[PDB]
Ligand binder design. Structure first.
Ligand SMILES: CC(C)(CO)[C@@H](O)C(=O)[O-]
Length: 304
């Protein structure tokens, strides 16, 4: 009898997180939907690499699958940059609808020519600013903060627009950098801040919600293409189910997160005027309009 094929998938976050739910659900569904013919071993906390290294590894084929935020993706697939524009998405429902519908479907196609099968869009969440130095109540309070960023050119340009001094770093370095005070802060969804225990190394958090962070199930293209057609469908369907449970965990994290982090001693600013943060980014946003075009930005904004 043919040997079960085993593949590996990893993330940079904890098993007990929104992304751990994503990959564990995916793995369970692949095994079920392929009648046990495929099995997926799951790795966490940047085992097998943090996100950029892992996306590269999947492209090379050194392991088969990864689940990553959109953060490091533009280096590989430039077309996703528009998703990383600050304040583009009104809320999670808007973002999820865009990604699941034809706009997001078109973006999945852009991975094919770069050596991936992008199985499905999933979610990291809306990102929020934390730091060790001071409470952030207005955009001016961000000026001069030394902040870690992802390896993403849109985020870096945007945050420089707030006067932040940016340091791109792989996620596997971040807890220690915060602890050592190399940087004052970072930015991430509540799902990450909670699961990574950043309350232990960050006194301040503001719910700026300044960008939406999608995530992706990625597979090596050559490997995906060699699967029998029915198993290709099983992998896609498993990824979509992983996205569903992932998003549900994000919802739970976002609902409980302010109370959870306050109880852990963080000062959490959840009353800001977001419109002032948008206004502060006007010059950078004018650049993004020139870069992406009004047509593409309005196409996303129009979405229901
Ligand atoms: C935590 C993370 C790896 C999750 O995708 C990402 O948001 C990041 O690098 O900050």
């Amino acid at each position: 009898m043919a040997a079960q094929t085993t593949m590996r998938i990893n993330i940079s976050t904890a098993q007990n997180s929104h992304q751990g739910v994503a990959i564990d659900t995916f793995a369970k569904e692949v095994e079920k939907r392929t009648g046990g013919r495929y099995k997926v071993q799951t790795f966490y906390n940047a085992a097998l690499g943090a996100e950029r290294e892992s996306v590269e590894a999947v492209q090379l084929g050194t392991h088969e699958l990864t689940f990553s935020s959109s953060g490091p993706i533009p280096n590989f697939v430039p077309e996703t940059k528009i998703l990383d524009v600050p304040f583009l998405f009104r809320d999670k429902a808007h973002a999820r609808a865009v990604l699941d519908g034809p706009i997001g479907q078109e973006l999945l196609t852009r991975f094919d020519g770069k050596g991936f099968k992008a199985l499905a869009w999933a979610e990291n969440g809306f990102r929020h600013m934390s730091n060790s130095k001071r409470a952030v109540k207005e955009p001016g309070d961000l000026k001069g903060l030394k902040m870690r960023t992802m390896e993403n050119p849109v985020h870096i340009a945007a945050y420089k627009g707030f006067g932040i001094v940016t340091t791109p770093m792989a996620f596997s370095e971040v807890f220690t950098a915060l602890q050592q005070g190399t940087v004052d802060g970072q930015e991430n969804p509540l799902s990450v801040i909670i699961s990574a225990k950043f309350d232990q190394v960050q006194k301040h958090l503001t719910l700026t919600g300044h960008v939406y962070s999608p995530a992706l199930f990625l597979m090596n293209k050559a490997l995906f293409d060699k699967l029998p057609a029915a198993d290709q469908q099983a992998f896609i369907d498993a990824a979509r189910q992983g996205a569903k449970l992932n998003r549900a965990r994000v919802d739970e994290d976002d609902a409980k997160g302010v109370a959870d982090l306050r109880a852990k001693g963080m000062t959490v600013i959840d009353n800001i005027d977001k419109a002032r943060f948008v206004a502060a980014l006007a010059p950078v946003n004018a650049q993004f309009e020139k870069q992406f075009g009004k047509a593409a930005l309005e196409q996303i904004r129009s979405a229901q």
